[PDB]
Amino acid sequence: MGAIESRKLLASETPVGQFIPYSHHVTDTIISTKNAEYLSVWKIDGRSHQSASEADVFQWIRELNNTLRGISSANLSLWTHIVRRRVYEYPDAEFDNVFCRQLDEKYRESFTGYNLMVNDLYLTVVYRPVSDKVLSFFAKRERETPDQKKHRQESCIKALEDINRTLGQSFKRYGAELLSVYEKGGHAFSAPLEFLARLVNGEHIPMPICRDRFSDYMAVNRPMFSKWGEVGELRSLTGLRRFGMLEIREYDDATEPGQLNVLLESDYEFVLTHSFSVLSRPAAKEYLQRHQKNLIDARDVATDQIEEIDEALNQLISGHFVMGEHHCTLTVYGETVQQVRDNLAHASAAMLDVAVLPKPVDLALEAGYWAQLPANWQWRPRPAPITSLNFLSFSPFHNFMSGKPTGNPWGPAVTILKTVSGTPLYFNFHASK
Amino acid sequence: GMLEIREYDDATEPGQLNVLLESDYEFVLTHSFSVLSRPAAKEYLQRHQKNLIDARDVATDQIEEIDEALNQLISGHFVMGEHHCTLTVYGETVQQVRDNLAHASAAMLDVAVLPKPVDLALEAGYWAQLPANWQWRPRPAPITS
Amino acid sequence: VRDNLAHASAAMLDVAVLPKPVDLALEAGYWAQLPANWQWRPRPAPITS
Amino acid sequence: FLARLVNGEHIPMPICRDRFSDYMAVNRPMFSKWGEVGELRSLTGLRRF
Amino acid sequence: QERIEGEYGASELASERRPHTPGARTLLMVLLCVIAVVLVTLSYKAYKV
Amino acid sequence: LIIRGAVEMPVAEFLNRCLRIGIIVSIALAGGLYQGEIANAITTVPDEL
Amino acid sequence: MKPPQQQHEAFPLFKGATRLPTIWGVPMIPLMAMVMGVAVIALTVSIWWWALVPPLWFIMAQITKNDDKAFRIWWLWIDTKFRNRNKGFWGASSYSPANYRKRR
Amino acid sequence: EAFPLFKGATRLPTIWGVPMIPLMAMVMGVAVIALTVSIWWWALVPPLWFIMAQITKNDDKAFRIWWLWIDTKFRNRNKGFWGASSYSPANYRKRR
Known part of the structure; x- marks a missing residue:
C-alpha cells in the first residue's frame, strides 16, 4: 500500500550495470570486462586540418592507414569519440592593477554570444581474445581453470600493450596521450573511467577506484528513454540533460577525406561515435565477392561494374586495406526537448550536406x-x-586547435583568443614537448 | 534530500568524511553496525571470494587482498557487521536542497568517496x-570494524 | 624468444611479406x-634474381 | 662461422684429422616436439631459439 | 638418490601446450550431435529396410 | 585441416556447406526406402482410377 | 566554410555494405524465425498451414530489400525498451543507477 | 618502381592441380588397398584426391612440410627421455 510500495518498486528494477560492460583495472592503462575483453583509451590532440593542402590530408590518411594495416589483427576494434563540450573550467581571475582589471572585464565582455566549446577526441582500441562468434557461442558456456584464465590474461595484455605502443608511435604528429591511473589523496582515480562515465552520465564525475566491479558504481545519473521517440533525459543533481541520438545509414560513391568536419564547427554540444570491428581477410573477401556477384548479375556497366571491383579485390588480397563493421551515432545534448530536436535537424542538414544520408x-534509441x-x-x-581507408576517412582525427584551458603548469590558460575558424583558442605559453 | 555513502575501501584518514563537520547546511549523517557473528563473517568472506574467483576475468589485485583479509579476521581481531551510510541534508527551497547535495557530493569526492x-529509496x-x-x-x- | 618472434613477425608484416x-619443420x-x-x-x- | 650457425656460439674450430661433420658440433641441441622454439644445452649457458 | 641439485635436467620445452581456439569445442560438439542424430535415423531406415 | 593451415571461413561457410552436403546426402540416401515409393505408384493407379 | 572536399580522388566505397548473408534475398536469422513460427502453427492447429510461408516470406523479402537491417532494429527494441517493466510509472523507460539486485 | 614479382612462385608442377609426388603417394596407397582387401576400392581415389586438391590450392607446399616433419622429428627415438628431440653432439656411431 502506501508504506511498503517503496521497496516493492525498488527491488523490481533493472540496474544500469546490465548494460555497462566493465570491471577492475587489470593494468594501469587497460580495463577488463565481464567477457574478458581488455581495452585502452587514447586521448588525442587531433592535428589541424584548415592549414594544409588538400593532397596533404590524403597523405596523412595514407600514413595512418599504412600504420594501421600492420597491426589490424582480426581481433581488434576501434571506438573514436569526438565529445564536443563547452568549457565550464576556466576560473575568473583575481587582479590588483586597475588597468588590467578593466582590460579583462572588457575582454570577457567581448565574448557575449560566442561558441565557447572545445572538441575532445578519443580512441579506444579493444581486444577480444576470440574473433569468430560461432565458437565464442560455446566459449561463453565452458568452464576454465584459473591458470589458463591467467594465460589468456597475459596473452591479451601483451597483445594490447603492443597495439598501444604501435599507436603511440603512429600518432607522433597527433599529440596522442594514453590515459592511465592517477592518484589523488592516497586513493586511485581512473583516467579512462572518467571518459567512459562521461559517455554514460553526460557529466564529468571523477571516478575513484573502489572495491567493486566498475559496472556496479560507474553510473550516478538515472537515465530516462522515451517510449516512442528519439530523445531522452538524464536526471542528475546538477540538472537535467536531454539527449537526442542520430544515425548514419546511407553512404555514397565517395569517401572524401574528413567529410565529417562540418560537425566540428557545431553550435550544439554533442558526442559523435564510431566503431570498426576489424574483420578477417577471408570474411572480407567473401563480402566483396558477394558485392561482385550481385553487381555482375546485371547489365554490364562500362566502368563502375568491372574494373573497380577488379582493383578492389586485388588490393584486398594484396593487403592494402582491411574491411570492418562500422556504425556512427551522433548524439546531441540539450536542455529542452524542442531544442535537442532543433539541434538534431541541424545535424541532419549538416550530414546531408556532405552526402551521407542520416x-x-x-526504435533503437x-x-x-x-x-x-x-x-x-x-x-x-x-x-x-566498409573499407578501412573509408573508416579512417570518417575519423581522420582532425580538430581545430584549442589548447588546454586548465591543468597547465602555471594553472589556468593565460588568454582566450578569437579564431577565424570560430572555435576559441585557449592561449598559453607552455606548449607540449 | 538524501545521499547514500556506500564505501568499501579502507579509509585513508582515521576520520575520512569529517569535511562535513564544517558546512553551511544541516544534516543527520547516519551509520549502523549490525554485527555479524564470527562464523557468519567467515562464511560471507568465503562466498565473496568464491564469486569473485568464478568469473571470466582474473583480477589479482582483488583476490589476494580478500584472501589476506579472511585470515586477518581471525588473527587481526576485528569483528565485521552490516553498515549503511546515509546523509540527509535539510533546506528551505528544493533547489537549495539540490545545491546542498551537489556541494556535499563535491566535498566528499575530494576525500575519495563517491556519493x-x-x-526511490528515500x-x-x-x-x-x-x-x-x-x-x-x-x-x-x-564492513570491517 | 616468443616475444621476439612476435616482434619480428610485426616487422616483416610492416614491409608486406606475410610471415x-x-x-612442424622447425x-x-x-x-x-x-x-x-x-x-x-x-x-x-x-623468384626473379 | 658455420659452427656459429650450428652451435649458436663462436667456438674456434681447429683442423683436426677427421671429417668436420664428426667434431664440428659442441652443443647438444634440443627441439620441441610440438612448437617453434628449441634449446641449446652448452657449457656457457642455455640459448633458446 | 634424487636428481642432482642445480643441473640441467629434462627440457623446459615439454611444458608447452597447443592452445585451443575457444569456440572449436562447443560448436564441434553441437555439430556432432546433429550429424549423429541424422546418422542414427539413417541406420534406423537401413536396418528397417 | 581448415582450422590448421588451409583457407577457411570457419563458422559461416564451412558449417553452411557441410549442412548443404548433409541434407542432400540424407535425401539421396532416403531413396533406400524404395519399396515405399513403388507401392505408392502401384496404389496411386487404382485409387485414382 | 569548406573543409577538405572531393575531386573524384575519394577512396572508393563499394555497395557490399550491409549486403547481409541472404538466402532467396532474406537473412538467415529472421527467416529461421519465420520457419519456427510457421512450424509451430503447422504442428498446433493444422498441417495445411505451410501455405502461410510464401505470403509472409515475400513480405519479408520486400522489407529486407528496401531497408536491409530492419530486423536487427526490431529485435533490439523488443529486447530492451519492450521488456523494461516500469515504463508507465516513470513516464519513460528508466534504469536505476544504484545496483538494487534485490539483495537486502 | 619496385622490381616486379610474379606469382609463378610455388606454382608447383601439378596435374589436375595437385603435385606429382603426393599424388603418386596416393596412387600407391589406393593401389595397395585395392590389391589387399577388395577391387571395388578405386572409389577411394576421388574423395581424398579432391581433399588434396583443396589442401594444395590453399597452401601450395603443405606436403613438403609434412614429409620433413615425418622424416626428422617423428623418427627421432628418445623424444620422451629428454623432454625434447635431441641429437648427441659427440658422434657415437656404436663403434666401441
Whole structure:
C-alpha cells in the first residue's frame, strides 16, 4: 500500500550495470570486462586540418592507414569519440592593477554570444581474445581453470600493450596521450573511467577506484528513454540533460577525406561515435565477392561494374586495406526537448550536406545509447562493413586547435583568443614537448 | 534530500568524511553496525571470494587482498557487521536542497568517496534512521570494524 | 624468444611479406641454414634474381 | 662461422684429422616436439631459439 | 638418490601446450550431435529396410 | 585441416556447406526406402482410377 | 566554410555494405524465425498451414530489400525498451543507477 | 618502381592441380588397398584426391612440410627421455 510500495518498486528494477560492460583495472592503462575483453583509451590532440593542402590530408590518411594495416589483427576494434563540450573550467581571475582589471572585464565582455566549446577526441582500441562468434557461442558456456584464465590474461595484455605502443608511435604528429591511473589523496582515480562515465552520465564525475566491479558504481545519473521517440533525459543533481541520438545509414560513391568536419564547427554540444570491428581477410573477401556477384548479375556497366571491383579485390588480397563493421551515432545534448530536436535537424542538414544520408534513430534509441560504450557490439543498431581507408576517412582525427584551458603548469590558460575558424583558442605559453 | 555513502575501501584518514563537520547546511549523517557473528563473517568472506574467483576475468589485485583479509579476521581481531551510510541534508527551497547535495557530493569526492544520490529509496532511507529499524536499510554491505 | 618472434613477425608484416612461424619443420629449417643443404629447406619458392 | 650457425656460439674450430661433420658440433641441441622454439644445452649457458 | 641439485635436467620445452581456439569445442560438439542424430535415423531406415 | 593451415571461413561457410552436403546426402540416401515409393505408384493407379 | 572536399580522388566505397548473408534475398536469422513460427502453427492447429510461408516470406523479402537491417532494429527494441517493466510509472523507460539486485 | 614479382612462385608442377609426388603417394596407397582387401576400392581415389586438391590450392607446399616433419622429428627415438628431440653432439656411431 502506501508504506511498503517503496521497496516493492525498488527491488523490481533493472540496474544500469546490465548494460555497462566493465570491471577492475587489470593494468594501469587497460580495463577488463565481464567477457574478458581488455581495452585502452587514447586521448588525442587531433592535428589541424584548415592549414594544409588538400593532397596533404590524403597523405596523412595514407600514413595512418599504412600504420594501421600492420597491426589490424582480426581481433581488434576501434571506438573514436569526438565529445564536443563547452568549457565550464576556466576560473575568473583575481587582479590588483586597475588597468588590467578593466582590460579583462572588457575582454570577457567581448565574448557575449560566442561558441565557447572545445572538441575532445578519443580512441579506444579493444581486444577480444576470440574473433569468430560461432565458437565464442560455446566459449561463453565452458568452464576454465584459473591458470589458463591467467594465460589468456597475459596473452591479451601483451597483445594490447603492443597495439598501444604501435599507436603511440603512429600518432607522433597527433599529440596522442594514453590515459592511465592517477592518484589523488592516497586513493586511485581512473583516467579512462572518467571518459567512459562521461559517455554514460553526460557529466564529468571523477571516478575513484573502489572495491567493486566498475559496472556496479560507474553510473550516478538515472537515465530516462522515451517510449516512442528519439530523445531522452538524464536526471542528475546538477540538472537535467536531454539527449537526442542520430544515425548514419546511407553512404555514397565517395569517401572524401574528413567529410565529417562540418560537425566540428557545431553550435550544439554533442558526442559523435564510431566503431570498426576489424574483420578477417577471408570474411572480407567473401563480402566483396558477394558485392561482385550481385553487381555482375546485371547489365554490364562500362566502368563502375568491372574494373573497380577488379582493383578492389586485388588490393584486398594484396593487403592494402582491411574491411570492418562500422556504425556512427551522433548524439546531441540539450536542455529542452524542442531544442535537442532543433539541434538534431541541424545535424541532419549538416550530414546531408556532405552526402551521407542520416535517419534519426527512433526504435533503437536505447540500443544506440548503450552502443557508445566501448566493448559493446551486441548493442550496435546498424553495423555495415566498409573499407578501412573509408573508416579512417570518417575519423581522420582532425580538430581545430584549442589548447588546454586548465591543468597547465602555471594553472589556468593565460588568454582566450578569437579564431577565424570560430572555435576559441585557449592561449598559453607552455606548449607540449 | 538524501545521499547514500556506500564505501568499501579502507579509509585513508582515521576520520575520512569529517569535511562535513564544517558546512553551511544541516544534516543527520547516519551509520549502523549490525554485527555479524564470527562464523557468519567467515562464511560471507568465503562466498565473496568464491564469486569473485568464478568469473571470466582474473583480477589479482582483488583476490589476494580478500584472501589476506579472511585470515586477518581471525588473527587481526576485528569483528565485521552490516553498515549503511546515509546523509540527509535539510533546506528551505528544493533547489537549495539540490545545491546542498551537489556541494556535499563535491566535498566528499575530494576525500575519495563517491556519493550515490537516492531517488526511490528515500522513504526506506529516512525510516531506516530510527535505531532498531534494521528492516528499512536500503542496501547494507558488510564492513570491517 | 616468443616475444621476439612476435616482434619480428610485426616487422616483416610492416614491409608486406606475410610471415608464418615455422612449427612442424622447425628442425628441418634449423638444418636448412647450413650452406649446401637443399634437402632440408621447408619452402623453396622461385623468384626473379 | 658455420659452427656459429650450428652451435649458436663462436667456438674456434681447429683442423683436426677427421671429417668436420664428426667434431664440428659442441652443443647438444634440443627441439620441441610440438612448437617453434628449441634449446641449446652448452657449457656457457642455455640459448633458446 | 634424487636428481642432482642445480643441473640441467629434462627440457623446459615439454611444458608447452597447443592452445585451443575457444569456440572449436562447443560448436564441434553441437555439430556432432546433429550429424549423429541424422546418422542414427539413417541406420534406423537401413536396418528397417 | 581448415582450422590448421588451409583457407577457411570457419563458422559461416564451412558449417553452411557441410549442412548443404548433409541434407542432400540424407535425401539421396532416403531413396533406400524404395519399396515405399513403388507401392505408392502401384496404389496411386487404382485409387485414382 | 569548406573543409577538405572531393575531386573524384575519394577512396572508393563499394555497395557490399550491409549486403547481409541472404538466402532467396532474406537473412538467415529472421527467416529461421519465420520457419519456427510457421512450424509451430503447422504442428498446433493444422498441417495445411505451410501455405502461410510464401505470403509472409515475400513480405519479408520486400522489407529486407528496401531497408536491409530492419530486423536487427526490431529485435533490439523488443529486447530492451519492450521488456523494461516500469515504463508507465516513470513516464519513460528508466534504469536505476544504484545496483538494487534485490539483495537486502 | 619496385622490381616486379610474379606469382609463378610455388606454382608447383601439378596435374589436375595437385603435385606429382603426393599424388603418386596416393596412387600407391589406393593401389595397395585395392590389391589387399577388395577391387571395388578405386572409389577411394576421388574423395581424398579432391581433399588434396583443396589442401594444395590453399597452401601450395603443405606436403613438403609434412614429409620433413615425418622424416626428422617423428623418427627421432628418445623424444620422451629428454623432454625434447635431441641429437648427441659427440658422434657415437656404436663403434666401441
